[PDB]
Design a binder for this molecule. Structure first.
Ligand code: NA
Ligand code: NA
Ligand code: NA
Ligand code: NI
Ligand code: NI
Ligand code: NI
Ligand code: NI
Ligand code: NI
Ligand code: NI
Ligand code: NI
Ligand code: NI
Ligand code: NI
Ligand code: NI
Ligand code: NI
Ligand code: NI
Lengths: 140, 140, 140, 140
DNA sequence: CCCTGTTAGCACAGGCTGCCCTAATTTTAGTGG
DNA sequence: CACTAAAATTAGGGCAGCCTGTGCTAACAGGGC
């Protein structure tokens, strides 16, 4: 198992965080946040272009395709739903929830996601306050 | 990401499965169970033997080492606690919870397992009846 | 510096050697001979195919392009002239010449090569009996 | 292969050159002579500093460590024993021997160096008049 | 415009291990003669 | 021991995903001519 559990999904989520924070998505940002060498993130981002999940712009900005944005959103959704489960229900300490959720985001089915929306009483936010994306696309 | 999520863990737990059922743990069993080829299974098993996780015994059986066994128990434990959590709290359909728990077992920290035991009122079994191993060494 | 000094050239000359011994040139033979990993050679071989030096047949034979074989021949010429110089003139023990010539083949210019045909009295074989190829196309 | 063949050795030997010439060894000086960019030589210098090959003094003068000096001496010695060999034995036109010995210095074993000392009747200088350093260390 | 160097963000070459495959054998455990 | 069925190996790959080394341009900074 990868330390990232799913590399591709971690690249998508990271680009998405960047968009949330209002910083320009560059390969250099992904290498910083995931502690990887430039040649590593360059090659991996190429594989993701090949598979149509992102594209490198002329100015080197990373952009999510439609397939890549739909997936990124899905992962962010599971992440924050996992965060809620972990805090509201399990009571895992705060400073551990993101780290745990960062693994959970790559394995939770949408089947489970929909159950969690019901069980956690229709949560629109993570336990930190960040809005949960893609609830419509989940189907809620 | 790996279909198995964690190949090493799925190999250890699969060996746990065969021991629990009373069938001789052979590489040929892992090939059937995990649907992989013989060459693949021997190759991975070699890595795991190299890494101190198991031995290929003189008569070909796969004996888990002490490190291998602790991990195998830790993974089976997370699996059945995940199964309990999914049925009792999340309400995932029976048909599906094993498939789900087969992924969660690979990402759940012991920190969450300990908090699950309480959340689930000191469970001793999976919803399918099988006993939950390693509750002692989990520290409860 | 590379341990091979020149990876591409060593690959070419290795292919040359294999052909010369009458063994089918496969990536596996190169992996053995240069002690490199399988993915390393397949990747290097890919660059060489990108660059017009060879192609991988459908049955996985490595086929030198006309340009590829010209470079291959050119390197062995340098190798074997270097062996003549090192034995006939410099007097390096017989056991250590191939090792030295193996690094030399990669830095020798054609100008030097041509001066060595003169100085060594139109040589036509290695000290070990093997013919020096590429003399005609050298400028002889 | 690298155009310099061995970047580290060419950096060491270049520093050594400047010291013979009595010019202050600065990174700008290296950039100049090997025709590379400021950034490149700045990065390459720090790897070497890292590996204990040189010190960058408070005033920015590059300074060889005893380990860096020993390697620079050995490359200069190879460079000049090669020059000798190229003029006296091989007969390569004058205008071309420095370019040829600029590559050979990086591949010649000490085993060959000691044979060249014997065969060229104990040379002390290059055909350009510059003294060959490290003949003592070589083991003569 | 030099000069000397830095910081940021790339490029390509050439290395690695993990974990997956087919085809074609070979070894081994158990069975029957 | 001799055939067989199950088990494992041998041979030669595949792709994903890590790495360091060694090169680049742009922008900038501080001082100089
Ligand atoms: Na790194
Ligand atoms: Na290797
Ligand atoms: Na340049
Ligand atoms: Ni943009
Ligand atoms: Ni988070
Ligand atoms: Ni994650
Ligand atoms: Ni046994
Ligand atoms: Ni189960
Ligand atoms: Ni699993
Ligand atoms: Ni063929
Ligand atoms: Ni040879
Ligand atoms: Ni060579
Ligand atoms: Ni100084
Ligand atoms: Ni010179
Ligand atoms: Ni040089």
């Amino acid at each position: 198992m990868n330390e990232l559990v799913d590399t591709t999904e971690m690249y998508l989520r990271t680009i998405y965080d960047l968009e949330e924070e209002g910083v320009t998505p560059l390969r250099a940002r992904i290498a910083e946040r995931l502690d990887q060498s430039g040649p590593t993130v360059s090659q991996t981002v190429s594989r993701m272009e090949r598979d149509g999940l992102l594209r490198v712009a002329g100015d080197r900005h990373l952009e999510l395709t439609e397939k890549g944005r739909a997936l990124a959103i899905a992962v962010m959704r599971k992440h924050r739903l996992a965060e809620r489960l972990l805090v509201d229900v399990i009571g895992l300490p705060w400073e551990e929830v993101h780290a745990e959720a960062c693994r959970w985001e790559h394995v939770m089915s949408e089947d489970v996601e929909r159950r969690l929306v019901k069980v956690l009483n229709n949560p629109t936010t993570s336990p930190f306050g960040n809005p949960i994306p893609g609830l419509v696309e989940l189907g809620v």
